């Protein structure tokens, strides 16, 4: 046989919460569709049992995968301080932490660590909102518009095919918003009825109108699907190409508001710092959250905004075959440090682990034989690499230090 030349030494998983009920149910939503939105089992913005199971599946799998890689024992509960789990203060992220622990080491008491004050935002998951740092308005306004080809109108103008597909699913033409149209001289259109304006403040960036509404509407259609509801979008979404076209509006909003470096770098700094420290070898010690780092496996329950920010900041671009959502619920940005046995040099690998939309629809159990999707990522800013295509620890450390915004560190 041929022995392993690389040995997995540390794992850091930044995961998006699991499938949850549509965070909202506004009046605008019922005005763009004559149909009735299907009710969910849990409260809005809360993780659903199905969501928790799906996450637990990923956990079962990572346990198997890490065992095969020898970082985790095949049996029993991992050693005290071998696996750490951190979660944003939200209900949905906290439960994603539990769901993942339960699947990684069932019956084992792995606590999920969060900010002590759960009624207040955790700066780790967004240093802007809690005033840790601010965005430079003018620079951010030009960066975002620049990414939009100069104007939001042109941006949307290039995605009308998708907007029309959405309108088709909503039967928007016979909607209240369209029917009570004050300018029924022109044809009905989401982008026209709801003009999208770019709003930039010190702690926040938003895109009103159809851009943000479609992002939310299309995602919900995805959530219904992943939740196994009878007929997502009222049985009007019948093929893969329609799923991709719809969710593209969702990815578009994030490409602009969450991946733009001028937003991503500041919003991703706290996590970059944590990830780097966790991936770098040094003397273990109770640190932020009462956790001990380094260790072996660190799992962080966050949001789609976080993975998108990290992608933007680290210049990591990906498309997930079989999954129309760029950063889907359960999706995991995985960082791994491998040590080359030859000279004991340190290396790091980044990938995106996700469940295809179908794997969520049929709630298919994962394991080495039936794995979730996976896309090995390349750091576009990394020069020093190994035969495996990974970035050196020094390269990655450099990429992190140059991308982070000192002013936004915790
Ligand atoms: Hg804790
Ligand atoms: Hg540490
Ligand atoms: Hg660590
Ligand atoms: Hg770790
Ligand atoms: Hg999403």
141 assigned binding-site residue: no
CB-based contact 367:64 (threshold 8 Å): yes
**Which of 258, 291, 317 is a domain's end point?**
258
Domain housing 247: 135-258
Determination technique used: X-ray
Bond preceding residue 347 cis, omega within 30 of 0: no
For residue 376 the two structure tokens come to 């090995």
Q: Which ligand is nearest to the CA of 285?
A: 2
Query: Taking a C-beta distance cutoff of 8 angstroms, is the pair 209, 252 a contact?
Result: no
Cα–Cα distance measured from residue 353 to residue 373, given in angstroms and rounded to the nearest whole number = 6
**227 and 97 share one domain:** no
Ordered DSSP codes for 301-354 = EE-HHHHHHHHHHHT----BTTB-SSS-TT-EEEEEEEEETTTTEEEEEEEEEE
Q: Are 203 and 114 within one domain?
A: no
Q: How far apart are CA 302 and CA 235, in angstroms?
A: 31
- 371 marked ligand binding residue: no
Q: Which residues have C-beta under 5 Å from ligand 1, the single-atom ion?
A: 113, 290
The Cβ-side half-sphere exposure at 148, using a 13 Å CA radius, reads: 23
Question: Domain check: are 365 and 386 in the same one?
Answer: yes
Alpha helices in 126-175 (DSSP H): 137-147, 152-157, 160-170
31, 316 contact by CB (below 8 A): no
- Is residue 41 part of an annotated ligand binding site? no
Do residue 250 and residue 383 come from a single domain? Answer: no
Distance (Å, rounded) from C-alpha 293 to C-alpha 275? Answer: 10
Contact 252, 152 (CB under 8 A): no
Q: Indicate the pairing of strand 297-302 with strand 6-16.
A: parallel
| Shared-domain flag, residues 200 and 211 | yes
Q: Which residue intervals of 203-260 are DSSP H helices?
A: 210-227, 240-257
Looking up tokens 């794992």 gives 11
- Give Cα 72 distance to the centre of its chain: 25
User: Residue 282's Cα: distance from chain center in Å?
Assistant: 28
User: Would you call 214 helix, strand, or coil by DSSP?
Assistant: helix
Q: What is the rounded distance in angstroms from the CA atom of residue 87 to the CA atom of residue 291?
A: 12
Ligand lying nearest the CA atom of residue 221: 5
What does DSSP say about strands 83-87 and 297-302: parallel, antiparallel, or unpaired? Answer: parallel
Tokens of 370: 């039936």
Q: What is the resolution of this structure in A?
A: 2.4
Rg (CA), the chain: 22
250, 167: one domain: yes
Which residues have a catalytic role annotated? 17, 304
Task: Enter the DSSP assignment of 386.
Answer: -
Instruction: Report how far Cα 165 is from the mean position of its chain's Cα atoms.
Output: 24
Q: Does 191 show up as a binding residue in the annotation?
A: no
Please give the distance of CA 228 from its chain centroid, rounded to a whole number: 21
**Is there a binding annotation on residue 295?**
no
Tokens of 257: 């508001």
Asked if 400 and 278 count as a contact pair (C-beta separation under 8 A), the reply is no
Distance 329 CA to ligand 5 centre (A): 7
Query: Does residue 187 come out as left (phi exceeding 0), alpha (psi in the -120 to 50 range) or beta?
Result: beta
Do β-strands 297-302 and 373-377 pair in parallel, antiparallel, or remain unpaired? Answer: unpaired
Q: How far, in Å, are 60, 193, 403 from residue 406 at the CA level?
A: 37, 42, 9
Ligand 2 centroid to residue 371 C-alpha, Å: 32
Same domain, 306 and 191: no
193 annotated as ligand-binding: no
Tell me: do 263 and 387 sit in the same domain: yes
95 and 224 together in one domain? no
For residues 319 and 271, give the distance between their C-alpha atoms in angstroms, rounded to a whole number: 22
Token digits of residue 115: 């900010």
Where a domain ends, among 209, 228, 258?
A: 258
CB 323 within 8 Å of CB 354: yes
What's the structural domain count of the chain? 2
In the block, residue with structure tokens 């009735």: 36
Please indicate, yes or no, whether residues 273 and 405 belong to a single structural domain of this protein. yes
Contact predicate 371/354, CB 8 Å: no
**Is 307 in the same domain as 396?**
yes
Quote the ligand 3 centre to 291 CA distance (angstroms): 10
> 406: closest CA among 288, 273, 309, 308?
273
**Structure token pair of residue 191:** 């982008």
Question: Three-class SS of residue 73?
Answer: coil
- Give 258's Cβ-side CA count (13 Å radius): 22
Name the packing angle between helices 304-314 and 240-257 (round to 10°): 70
For 219, the token pair is 């995602």
**CATH label of the domain that carries residue 390:** 3.40.50.1240
Phi, psi of 388 (to 5 degrees): -90, -5
Interval between CA 351 and ligand 5 midpoint (Å): 18
* DSSP characters over 99-138: HHHHHHSTT-----B--S-TTS--GGG-TTTTTSS---HH
Residues in the chain after which the backbone breaks (C–N beyond 2.5 Å) = none
Measured CA to CA in angstroms, residue 286 lies from 84, 96, 233, 269, 294 at distances of: 11, 23, 48, 21, 9
Tokens of 33: 């569709």
* Helices 160-170 and 240-257: angle between axes, nearest 10 degrees: 120
Regarding whether 125 and 141 lie in a shared domain, the answer is no
CA of 371 to the centre of ligand 1 (A): 31
Has 303 been labeled as part of a binding site? yes
Q: Are the C-beta atoms of residues 198 and 207 closer than 8 Å to each other?
A: yes
User: How far apart are the C-alpha atoms of 178 and 266, rounded to whole Å?
Assistant: 40
Gap from CA of 113 to ligand 1 centroid (Å)? 4
Å from CA of 382 to ligand 3 middle:
22
> Residue 328: nearest ligand to its CA?
5
Among the bound ligands, the one closest to the CA of 305: 5
Q: How far apart are CA 141 and CA 199, in angstroms?
A: 8
Contact between 371 and 348 (Cβ < 8 Å) = no
Please answer whether residues 105 and 310 qualify as being in contact, where contact means their C-beta atoms are separated by less than 8 angstroms: no
Which of 258, 275, 302 lies at the terminal end of a domain, its last residue? 258
């Amino acid at each position: 046989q041929s022995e392993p030349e690389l040995k997995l030494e540390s794992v850091v998983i930044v995961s998006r919460h699991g499938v949850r009920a549509p965070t909202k149910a506004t009046q605008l939503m019922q005005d763009v569709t004559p149909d009735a939105w299907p009710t969910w089992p849990v409260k809005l913005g809360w993780l659903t049992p199905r969501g928790g199971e799906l996450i637990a599946y990923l956990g079962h799998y990572q346990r198997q995968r890490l065992v095969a890689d020898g970082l985790l024992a095949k049996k029993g509960c991992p050693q005290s301080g071998q696996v750490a789990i951190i979660a944003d203060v939200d209900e949905r992220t906290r439960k994603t932490g539990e769901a993942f622990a339960a699947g990684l080491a069932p019956d084992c008491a792995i606590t999920v660590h969060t900010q002590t004050d759960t009624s207040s935002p955790d700066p780790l998951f967004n240093p802007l909102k809690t005033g840790v740092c601010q965005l430079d308005n003018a620079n951010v306004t030009d960066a975002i518009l620049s990414r939009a080809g100069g104007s939001i109108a042109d941006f949307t103008g290039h995605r009308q095919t998708a907007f029309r597909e959405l309108e088709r699913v909503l039967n928007f033409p016979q909607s209240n918003l369209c029917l009570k149209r004050e300018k029924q001289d022109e044809s009905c259109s989401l982008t026209q009825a709801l003009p999208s304006e770019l709003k930039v403040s010190a702690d926040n960036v938003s895109l009103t109108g159809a851009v943000s509404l479609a992002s939310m509407l299309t995602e919900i259609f995805l959530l219904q699907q992943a939740q196994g509801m009878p007929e997502p979008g009222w049985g009007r979404i019948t093929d893969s190409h329609q799923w991709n076209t719809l969710l593209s509006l969702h990815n578009a909003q994030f490409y602009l508001l969450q991946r733009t470096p001028e937003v991503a770098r500041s919003r991703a700094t706290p996590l970059l710092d944590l990830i780097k420290t966790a991936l770098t070898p040094h003397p273990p010690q109770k640190q932020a959250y009462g956790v001990t780092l380094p260790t072996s496996v660190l799992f962080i329950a966050g949001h789609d905004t976080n993975l998108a920010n990290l992608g933007g900041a680290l210049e990591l671009n990906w498309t997930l075959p079989g999954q129309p959502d760029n950063t889907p619920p359960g999706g995991e940005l995985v960082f791994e440090r491998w040590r080359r046995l030859s000279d004991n040099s340190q290396w790091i690998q980044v990938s995106l682990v996700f469940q295809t939309l179908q794997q969520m629809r049929d709630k298919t159990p994962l394991s080495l034989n039936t794995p979730p999707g996976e896309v090995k990522l390349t750091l576009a800013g990394c020069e020093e690499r190994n035969a495996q295509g990974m970035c050196s620890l020094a390269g990655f450390t450099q990429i992190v230090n140059e991308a982070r915004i000192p002013a936004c560190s915790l």
